Amino acid sequence: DVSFRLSGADPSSYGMFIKDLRNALPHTEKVYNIPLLLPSVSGAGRYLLMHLFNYDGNTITVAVDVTNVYIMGYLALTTSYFFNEPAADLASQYVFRSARRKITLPYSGNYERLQIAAGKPREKIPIGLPALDTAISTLLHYDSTAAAGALLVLIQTTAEAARFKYIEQQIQERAYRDEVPSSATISLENSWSGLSKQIQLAQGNNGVFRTPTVLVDSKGNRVQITNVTSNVVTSNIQLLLNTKNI
Ligand SMILES: O=c1ccn([C@@H]2O[C@H](COP(=O)(O)OP(=O)(O)OP(=O)(O)O)[C@@H](O)[C@H]2O)c(=O)[nH]1
Ligand SMILES: *[C@@H]1O[C@H](CO)[C@@H](O)[C@H](O)[C@H]1NC(C)=O
């Protein structure tokens, strides 16, 4: 398990949590020195539990699929909540079984469905450590519309930050003040599968992408990533989704 406490949180303690989260994901291989997530894991070992504590010390436990860093559901007090999708239903066979009741959320976990449920695109949802504190608090008491927004915050501040160093740094910059994600942040989130695939395809291609990946950069400029010498590959991305899952 991995843990993060919002009480006394700062950029350093958050960095330690994101390092812990990355290190809790198993891998047997690196591709261009980036951990390659496993094709599959059988049984309960598939799921990582994140213990998150809001500023007042209340806690939820979030179940993460270690193959893809996809949040499956969470436990709040004696109630478990899972996404309305088969992967989460499968996950509910292994985690939070001791919950007094289980609620299936009225949406799947993808950004599109969450944004529809939340009533807004995550372009307009501030993120940061205060937003994460709020998200935890919201998820403690069921409200599906509110939860969708909280989950968009949670996903970005945990999984996406684990996947990209740029995004952990964005959140560290928002340690004491929320701000909507940069376009670059959104671009990276949307490109994780594509980047993961092309970095793997580059292995037998002399480091060259079979298909370029278009990203937005920190200045708001749209750029093509064509090979593994790009800073996105050498510095930013920290985890690869296995092509077997793409
Ligand atoms: O479009 C998105 C948006 C978000 N996510 C990811 O969702 C994770 C938690 O949500 P899930 O992983 O459970 O939803 P899913 O994406 O498997 O849903 P389908 O599209 O497969 O129906 C988060 O870690 C985030 O990266 C997506 O996989 N796709
Ligand atoms: C590879 O990407 C680098 C960094 O963006 C770029 O300068 C160069 O033109 C590309 N080289 C090849 C061989 O594609």
Side-chain angles (χ1 to χ4, degrees), residues 108-164:
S108 69
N110 70 92
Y111 277 138
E112 171 175 314
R113 295 296 167 183
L114 284 168
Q115 286 176 171
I116 290 171
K120 43 176 47 164
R122 65 209 196 274
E123 280 79 351
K124 303 237 281 260
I125 304 169
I127 58 179
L129 296 184
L132 179 51
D133 185 34
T134 300
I136 295 160
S137 299
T138 289
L139 297 173
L140 290 169
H141 295 109
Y142 179 59
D143 167 353
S144 76
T145 296
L151 288 164
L152 289 168
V153 173
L154 175 68
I155 287 165
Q156 292 182 272
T157 62
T158 63
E160 301 289 14
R163 290 167 181 155
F164 296 99

Side-chain angles (χ1 to χ4, degrees), residues 85 95 104 133-134 148 165 191 219 229 236:
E85 60 178 287
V95 300
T104 304
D133 185 34
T134 300
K165 187 158 296 214
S191 298
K219 318 273 183 171
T229 69
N236 199 345

Side-chain angles (χ1 to χ4, degrees), residues 206-209 223-231:
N206 295 311
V208 175
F209 286 11
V223 56
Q224 285 213 322
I225 315 305
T226 59
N227 66 78
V228 299
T229 69
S230 158
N231 281 253

Side-chain angles (χ1 to χ4, degrees), residues 5 13 36 45 47 100 114 151 157 159 166 204 208 211:
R5 288 165 167 84
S13 73
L36 174 67
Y47 309 107
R100 282 199 71 240
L114 284 168
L151 288 164
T157 62
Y166 174 85
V208 175
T211 306

Side-chain angles (χ1 to χ4, degrees), residues 165-195:
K165 187 158 296 214
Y166 174 85
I167 294 176
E168 165 180 12
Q169 292 169 330
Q170 277 258 292
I171 303 313
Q172 289 173 311
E173 292 175 7
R174 294 156 171 70
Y176 315 116
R177 179 179 67 180
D178 295 328
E179 186 182 331
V180 294
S182 61
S183 298
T185 287
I186 296 293
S187 184
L188 291 162
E189 294 172 355
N190 293 338
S191 298
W192 184 60
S193 188
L195 281 166

